Design a protein around this ligand. Structure first.
Ligand SMILES: CC(C)[C@H](N)C(=O)OP(=O)(O)OC[C@H]1O[C@@H](n2cnc3c(N)ncnc32)[C@H](O)[C@@H]1O
Ligand SMILES: [Zn+2]
Length: 918
């Protein structure tokens, strides 16, 4: 046996990753040695890159969605660092708001107690966010991500709360913060106003009723008919107490039925078929002639003005809209257009209050009843004025944290105005809506489709309600001047409060008196001021991160505008939008240059992950099972810009991708492990096959890099895998196995192959470093030849090398053209397959080939096809137009197993020299 006499060609780099054991040691090392602060400190940094982290809410353990987010940021940041740039990536945490406070509220009820005290209540919220900020930081680090995680930004930091307030101050001083009174989203479960980003639309069952409002005697007499009752359709009988008007479409025909029901003519066929009204039409009237008629509410006998709405629809309902200014936005403006009462007797908990008694809007038995529980009895009380009751299902707004359905209540709140012109920094005049639309156009969106998703929301969004009635957050810390009943926006007062917030935090706004919150110039008039006690929308907190992080640290944590932000698709409704609006107020532009949007983590069915249905695949279990580098590769190897379905069969296919990458690196390290390192200093004479591989390596390297530049990691990884699978393993390593294992260690041709393998292993390490960082760190740990070839202590010294300069290749060396011999190789391998089907021969080495086109260099044909002989022989095997196969007229060599030995069981001529070399 000659197996002892072959080159060993082994490496300590193991085949099995054993990731759940080795990865924790790597990530713990990067924290001990401060790898990120070392990345920033790299002395040859050239250029700058800023990724501004969007702060996840400081609540709960991380799920797979958080991991997808951070891993994608980690790939983008590591890509820029390995391109040679100074990077800025300070992660942050969203600590205020209902995402944290609602958990305190739910914990207190399960604990059977409560908490009136403001300071102590904010403390338990603050401690909850601190506890889960630290839990999430360590779970992020167990994914291999690198950022300033030991110095993250926190909205609960005193300096940060002061930065948020100073951002609000800028909004106020530009004339965009104004009080408004109108119906808005109201969550009775937390007794607070809401805006769109705090609202979740989902399907809900609801009553759907058609109600008859009889015309009063004088209106019947003015219309000259015996009976007439306008029919309204509504899904909210809880608002009927607050009716003041019935709205019709302007200049539209309304049909009067023989039973005396008045509806829009365009809808009579639907309503008659529904059995709401009868089928016979006696008269038709124009809605213009019906305006200012008066009807009688059948619920409380109150008057109802027949009015004309701006856009009454004739596709649904009846063409007659029950109008309640207290509980509808378009209802409110119509009530003001006709100067009607704003009836609103629903308190902050969604229950009828004493206003129904004083204004006789509803029977006293409804006092204290919740509006949704009272609807069954209201419908019964409608009597025979109820023409038809159905139950339907419609999309309905719910509170994002209490998950209860919201209502609308006419209330006075604070708003950022969208269509109010304000003075631009360049001296011009524009509305916030116009500025945001122009700022969107300067932002690159990845994918491009996310642009008009944000553009559409900006085109249609209303004024932004900022004021909330909760405790955990940054207060709208302004004083109302009782003398003028306006807010005080004088700079000395606002900066005095801001300085106090910066040193002490926002707790002082609840604790201190009015005079102690006022500057010295103002205490003599302390009696004339009252504190606003609303807190800011938590989406204003996160929308201000660019100012608190990028601007207030003067580029020490990144430049404003940032180069890249990267969040999930639900952030067009949220952080993307709130940051755009706040950035457009302060700087008149978006605080980001590029938006990368990724999809959501969904189950095997494509359904949303819920902590209830159990479709949640826990991140911890996923990491223990597959390892972080496989989860990272699963992210990069999949269509992250769309939703990602989680199934263990998809991670198995990813492990096969990781095994293939890892097995390839093990072969490379094993087959240049014995190369004398003074080979690195001298130029080599590379073969045609060597140059084909070096030129192919250069071609796919440009493709992988160009794809990774566009963040299309699937495309680049496919180019990498196909190269690894076809050109590298299938062709090159197959043809070099004889020289690597059977030629002398001193053979210049074997040494040249090892340089090619060394170059290939360098390129794979560079391109895989941002994705499989622990694995590439492991590779460099096990190869002294790789560490000296790349001049790298570890993975963080990786640079994109020039293969030409480090291998001393000639300029204007004409590229190889293997289009002919590779097609002959394909044709031979097909014919070789069928000869093995018959069982004639077992290997390519048993064959001799005579090619009919002598243009093909003989020894390259022998190398690529791994025939033992090129030319004529005795025993024909089969023939094609291109070649003839013969049985190799030699014995199999006992050492290299090639058919090149002239005598049985005797080493071939090459192996004899090697076996006796001194
Ligand atoms: C200021 C913002 C960031 C706000 N604090 C917030 O929403 O913070 P939040 O903690 O809710 O999320 C923070 C980030 O995680 C992503 N995200 C959440 N659920 C996901 C899911 N099922 N699949 C994939 N990504 C998911 C989400 O888009 C965001 O980029
Ligand atoms: Zn041999």
């Amino acid at each position: 046996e000659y197996k002892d006499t072959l080159n060993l060609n082994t490496t300590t780099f193991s085949m099995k990753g054993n990731l759940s054991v080795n990865e924790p040691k790597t990530y713990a090392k990067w924290q001990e040695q401060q790898a990120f602060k070392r990345m920033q400190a790299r002395k040859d940094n050239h250029g700058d890159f800023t990724l501004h982290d969007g702060p996840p809410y400081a609540n709960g353990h991380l799920h797979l969605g958080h991991a997808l987010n951070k891993i994608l940021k980690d790939i983008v940041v590591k890509r820029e660092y390995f391109k040679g740039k100074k990077i800025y990536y300070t992660p942050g945490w969203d600590c205020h708001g209902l995402p944290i406070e609602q958990q305190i509220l739910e914990r207190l009820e399960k604990e059977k107690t409560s908490l009136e005290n403001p300071t102590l209540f904010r403390e338990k919220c603050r401690d909850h966010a601190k506890k889960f900020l630290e839990i999430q930081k360590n779970e992020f680090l167990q994914l291999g991500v690198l950022g300033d995680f030991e110095d993250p930004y926190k909205t609960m930091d005193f300096k940060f709360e002061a930065s948020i307030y100073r951002a609000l101050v800028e909004v106020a001083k530009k004339g965009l913060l104004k009080e408004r009174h109108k119906p808005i989203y109201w969550s009775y479960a937390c007794e607070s106003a809401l805006a769109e980003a705090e609202v979740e639309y989902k399907m809900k069952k609801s009553p759907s009723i058609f109600v008859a409002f009889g015309l009063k005697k004088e209106s019947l007499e003015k219309l000259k008919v015996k009976k007439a009752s306008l029919v309204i359709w509504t899904t909210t009988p809880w608002t009927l107490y607050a009716n003041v008007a019935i709205a019709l479409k302007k200049d539209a025909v309304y049909a009067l039925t023989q039973k005396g029901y008045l509806v829009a003519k365009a809808l009579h066929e639907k309503l008659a078929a529904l059995g709401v009204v009868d089928n016979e039409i006696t008269h038709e009237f124009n809605s213009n002639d019906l305006e200012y008629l008066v009807a009688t509410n059948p619920l409380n006998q109150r008057d109802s003005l027949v009015a004309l709405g701006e856009h009454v629809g004739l596709e649904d309902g009846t063409g007659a809209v029950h109008t309640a200014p207290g509980h509808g936005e378009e209802d409110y403006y119509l009530g003001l257009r006709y100067n009607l009462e704003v009836l609103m007797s629903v308190d902050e908990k969604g229950c009828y209050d004493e206003g129904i008694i004083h204004n006789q809007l509803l029977d006293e038995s409804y006092l204290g009843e919740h509006v949704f529980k009272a609807q069954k009895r209201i419908i019964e009380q409608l009597g025979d004025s109820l023409l038809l009751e159905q139950e339907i299902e419609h999309s309905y707004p719910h509170c994002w944290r209490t998950h209860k359905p919201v209502i609308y209540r006419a209330t006075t709140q604070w708003f950022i105005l969208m269509d109010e012109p304000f003075i631009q920094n360049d001296g011009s005049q524009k509305t916030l809506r116009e500025v945001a639309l122009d700022a969107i156009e300067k932002v690159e969106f990845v994918p491009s489709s996310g642009k008009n998703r944000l553009k559409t929301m900006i085109e249609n969004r209303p004024d932004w309600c900022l004021s909330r009635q909760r405790k955990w957050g940054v207060p709208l810390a302004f004083f109302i001047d009782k003398r003028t009943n306006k807010p005080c926006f004088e700079s000395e007062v606002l900066e005095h409060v801001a300085n106090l917030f910066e040193k002490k935090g926002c707790d002082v706004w609840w604790e201190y008196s009015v005079k102690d919150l006022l500057p010295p110039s103002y205490q003599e008039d302390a009696k004339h001021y009252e504190k606003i006690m609303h807190i800011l929308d938590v989406w204003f907190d996160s929308g201000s991160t660019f100012k608190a992080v990028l601007e207030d640290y003067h580029g020490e944590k990144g430049q404003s505008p940032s180069d890249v932000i990267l969040e999930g698709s639900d952030q067009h409704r949220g952080w993307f939008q709130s940051s755009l609006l706040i950035g457009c107020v302060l700087n008149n532009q978006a605080p980001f240059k590029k938006v990368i949007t990724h999809g959501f983590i969904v189950d095997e069915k494509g359904e949303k992950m819920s902590k209830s249905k159990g479709n949640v695949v826990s991140l911890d279990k996923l990491l223990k099972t597959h390892g972080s580098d496989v989860v990272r590769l699963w992210v990069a190897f999949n269509d992250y810009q769309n939703d990602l379905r989680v199934s263990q069969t998809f991670f198995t296919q990813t492990e096969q991708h990781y095994k293939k990458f890892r097995n390839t690196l093990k072969f490379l390290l094993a087959n240049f492990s014995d190369m004398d390192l003074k080979n690195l200093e001298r130029p080599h004479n590379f073969s045609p096959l060597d140059h084909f591989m070096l030129e192919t390596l250069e071609t796919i390297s440009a493709g992988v890099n160009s794809a990774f530049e566009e963040h299309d990691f699937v495309k680049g990884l496919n180019i990498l895998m196909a190269f690894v699978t076809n050109e590298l393993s299938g062709i090159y390593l197959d043809a070099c196995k004889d020289s690597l294992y059977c030629d002398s260690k001193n053979n210049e041709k074997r040494q040249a192959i090892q340089m090619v393998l060394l170059a290939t292993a360098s390129k794979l390490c560079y391109f895989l470093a941002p994705i499989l960082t622990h694995t590439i760190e492991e590779v460099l740990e096990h190869s002294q030849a790789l560490r000296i070839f790349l001049q790298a202590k570890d993975v963080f010294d990786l640079k994109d090398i020039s293969v030409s300069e480090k291998l001393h290749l000639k300029e204007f060396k004409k590229p190889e053209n293997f289009e002919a011999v590779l097609a002959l190789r394909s044709a031979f391998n097909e014919e070789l397959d069928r000869l093995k089907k018959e069982g004639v021969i077992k290997n390519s080495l048993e064959c001799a080939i005579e090619v009919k086109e002598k243009a093909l260099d003989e020894n390259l044909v022998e190398e690529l096809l791994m025939v033992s002989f090129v030319g004529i022989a005795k025993e024909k095997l089969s023939e094609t137009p291109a070649f003839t196969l013969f049985k190799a007229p030699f014995y199999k060599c006992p050492r290299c197993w090639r058919f090149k030995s002239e005598l049985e069981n005797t080493p071939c001529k090459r192996c004899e020299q090697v076996l006796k070399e001194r």
